[PDB]
Amino acid sequence: GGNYNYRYRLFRKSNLKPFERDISTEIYQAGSTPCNGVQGFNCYFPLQS
Amino acid sequence: GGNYNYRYRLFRKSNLKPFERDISTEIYQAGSTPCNGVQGFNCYFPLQS
């Protein structure tokens, strides 16, 4: 049926330092409008399955 | 950069009647545990970009 438990980060403001772990799960603002924690136009979830 | 503003339904309880449209965006419980509207193990968002 397809596993969807495994996910990876897709969006970040900046790259990661070596041996750095990022676990933050917050709405990513790709535009010039606040997202207010709402997925929508130009407001994407950071993790992808 | 990748247009991510186009999304489609991926999970639903059953098929659609002809000429029917659905817009609900509540979490999908793929397992035997309530998800409380939180993405996680066996709980996925119904839409994909």
Curated annotation (Swiss-Prot), chains A, B:
Region annotation (Disordered) maps to: 10-45
The reported result of mutating T33K is: In strain: Delta/B.1.617.2, Omicron/BA.1, Omicron/BA.2, Omicron/BA.2.12.1, Omicron/BA.2.75, Omicron/BA.4, Omicron/BA.5, Omicron/BQ.1.1, Omicron/XBB.1.5, Omicron/EG.5.1
* Positions of region (Immunodominant HLA epitope recognized by the CD8+): 3-11
User: Residues annotated as region Receptor-binding motif?
Assistant: 1-49
Query: What intrachain disulfides are recorded?
Result: C35-C43
Give the recorded effect for Q48N.
Reduced host ACE2-binding affinity in vitro
Q: What is the effect of changing F41V?
A: In strain: Omicron/BA.4, Omicron/BA.5, Omicron/BQ.1.1
Q: What is the effect of changing G1S?
A: In strain: Omicron/BA.1, Omicron/BA.2.75, Omicron/XBB.1.5, Omicron/EG.5.1
Q: How does it assemble?
A: Binds to host ACE2. RBD also interacts with the N-linked glycan on 'Asn-90' of ACE2. Cleavage of S generates a polybasic C-terminal sequence on S1 that binds to host Neuropilin-1 (NRP1) and Neuropilin-2 (NRP2) receptors. Interacts with host integrin alpha-5/beta-1 (ITGA5:ITGB1) and with ACE2 in complex with integrin alpha-5/beta-1 (ITGA5:ITGB1). May interact via cytoplasmic c-terminus with M protein. May interact (via N-terminus) with host bilirubin and biliverdin, thereby preventing antibody binding to the SARS-CoV-2 spike NTD via an allosteric mechanism.
Q: What does this protein do?
A: Attaches the virion to the cell membrane by interacting with host receptor, initiating the infection. The major receptor is host ACE2. When S2/S2' has been cleaved, binding to the receptor triggers direct fusion at the cell membrane. When S2/S2' has not been cleaved, binding to the receptor results in internalization of the virus by endocytosis using host TFRC and GRM2 and leading to fusion of the virion membrane with the host endosomal membrane. Alternatively, may use NRP1/NRP2 and integrin as entry receptors.
This protein is called Spike protein S1
Species the sequence originates in: Severe acute respiratory syndrome coronavirus 2
Underlying gene: S
Residue numbers of the full-length protein present here: 446 to 494 of 1273
